[PDB]
Symmetry: D3
Subunit: 132 residues, 6 copies
């Protein structure tokens, strides 16, 4: 059951030099890069589209400002059950063994985004890779 | 608390160049090698025995087919509470932090086997190390 | 949510050459060293104070002997939610992903101490770094 | 001392699951990504250009054949003395401590390319990033 | 140009827990295990055969005593130019980047043996794997 | 051939979160910590003494400023041929395999100091650990 899912490497990973570390954890779990873009600075409307379901929250504006404060990488990964597996790999800051659990300690600056559903996956892929 | 357990390193570990990575995780938790064998290709007889409790399942023969498709290493490890601790180290493909959690993504090609009981262990050690 | 916590690196870490491995796991999660002392052999008095709540237990004296059988490092660490996070990082010998989860397999020789509460942390800092 | 250089991650890196390992070694020495592109299959045109200085050699077409046999990543890196330092990081299959030294074992499938001069760099960056 | 070569993991690697580390360095360089034996204690005449060209040196007896002080693993590795490549990977205690250069600091207890010639390779393989 | 040497961990290691990485490389080569001090900011006097042979150079004052711009750790290390081995481990920003070779790219900010001779080592130990 192959799926594809959208990942973003966030500006705190560039600042802290953790880009290969995060990418390597997904690589070691046998997921493949199908497409990839580097953005020295992502255009703000792409970020706002990406986070559109969050538009009414108190943190919305501040988080977009963080996301435009440095480089980001967008990646489409392919593999069995990709969506849910990469989501678990991302985890959270309370859970040792995961990316966030081992390397992050903040509510905003948490290194990585992964799609959490099939629909969000489909939509997020179309935002960052509209040539399809 | 001393105990011995049986581990198999599966053909996908050789294919993917992950043999030392798996062994190193067990080494780091302070478990010691008691015996070990390299098999370039295992006799199907031994595999069928090792998985006898599984002989009536849809997946039985496909899994046997895979277990003979390349090399395997069989190892006896020893340490305090070795059976349960090494089994936890093995984990599953759903749980990060474990061997299968960090490295494997399939129902069949999952890198490693560890005995799950005192009875499994005695019986599996005897299969691979008469 | 900035806090301070007390960590001890135990003699077994020195014996098994795991000192930097342990310190690196805390470092990578973004906690900072605030003060540090190396003890080639800790004064028994300090260990007895440190484990006072355990004085009535049957393992008290044996543990004390172990803590005195090689070097220890005492560290004060700072960061958001430090007491609770460094405790999760410490873990237990059952669950992989943690320091103890990955590296230890003993009830006594388990590599690391971390404070487990706001009260225990203030006291433990005063034992090891009385300069106040 | 600021400088920019052109790196290719070759198809064998994808085959062997070594892409993050290579990138991480460059990251650790404090070099920064300036631009980067993923190619699922590179146009042979670009490869032939990239290796134009090599067009009269026995190995030329076999090497081109390999460079199109799977994905590649092209990256521009920047830092103090980037050309020489990243080239040293790349090393060769004979010298341990370098990327090729630790990880590669072949004359052709050697994981990575790095520009070797200021002139190579200007020209290679222009090929992959017009 | 495929060759095969003989490697021994020495008792100091078991004592120091460096067996996977050493094996992993050879694995990462794309060499394959063709055969392998574990010896909880190698018989002394095998060691003495293996080191027969060393029989007249002052260290001969002492080194054999070291080699019988703990477990050893014998491995036949296959790959292009295996003999000379694995020899370089082994290196020496003065050379950072190699097994001995990163992990050893002794004239006797230096973690790893590798064959240094085609003839020695052929002979050493026949000592530890005489079923051929 | 047992010796002692002086190592300083520089402010850039703290800045870039490389403290345990550096200490781990020395640890894995089997050298032992004999004494250790953490300095959140080192007294300028100590740094001036430490780099006295360099007082006439054009980089003296800038270097001093850098050494005082964040924390440092001072370590005494013991082991066979320690002065010369820890120096090789330190390396230079050109050759991979070493701490500087792998992790640094600056003439000034280069992560680590190690003593380079028997005389420099005795002096440097007296500056940082005068207790004698
Ligand atoms: N208070 C908050 C909550 C979330 N956020 C950011 O918004 C992202 C999306 O919020 P979320 O609760 O869906 O988190 P995840 O789904 O990414 O775990 C987070 O990952 C944070 O980067 C923030 O900046 N401030
Ligand atoms: N659908 C399945 C289920 C199990 N198996 C194999 O059979 C082994 C034993 O099945 P199991 O559910 O007890 O798995 P574990 O105990 O090994 O997690 C697994 O490790 C798989 O390699 C399979 O090939 N196909
Ligand atoms: N049976 C026991 C239990 C604990 N201990 C030691 O006493 C320490 C404190 O006990 P504890 O149960 O509070 O353990 P942690 O909070 O450190 O997990 C442990 O870390 C052990 O090192 C022991 O020597 N024997
Ligand atoms: N016999 C050869 C020699 C070189 N080559 C390829 O051509 C590239 C350039 O040749 P080169 O000798 O300048 O190698 P490097 O500068 O990349 O070390 C090499 O990286 C190889 O991938 C080959 O395929 N077959
Ligand atoms: N003085 C010495 C010299 C060598 N030896 C041992 O004998 C082995 C063979 O000696 P050698 O000089 O051929 O060393 P390598 O070829 O293994 O580098 C060494 O690797 C040491 O383990 C020793 O125990 N005492
Ligand atoms: N041009 C320079 C040279 C050295 N230095 C600093 O002065 C220290 C001592 O100089 P050095 O040439 O003895 O270098 P090492 O012996 O530490 O390699 C270096 O490690 C640099 O941190 C500097 O700031 N600017
Ligand atoms: Mg969400
Ligand atoms: Mg089962
Ligand atoms: Mg407790
Ligand atoms: Mg060239
Ligand atoms: Mg020799
Ligand atoms: Mg100097």
């Amino acid at each position: 059951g192959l799926q594809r899912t959208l990942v973003l490497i966030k500006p705190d990973a560039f600042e802290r030099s953790l880009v290969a570390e995060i990418m390597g954890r997904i690589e070691k779990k046998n997921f493949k890069i199908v497409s990839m873009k580097f953005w020295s600075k992502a255009p703000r409307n792409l970020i706002e589209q990406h986070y559109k379901e969050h538009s009414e929250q108190s943190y919305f504006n501040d988080n977009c400002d963080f996301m435009v404060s440095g480089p980001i990488i967008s990646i489409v990964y392919e593999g069995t059950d990709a969506i849910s597996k990469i989501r678990r790999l991302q985890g959270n800051i309370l859970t040792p063994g995961t990316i966030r659990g081992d390397l992050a300690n903040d509510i905003r600056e948490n290194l990585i985004h992964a799609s959490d559903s099939e629909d969000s996956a489909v939509d997020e892929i179309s935002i960052w890779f509209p040539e399809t």
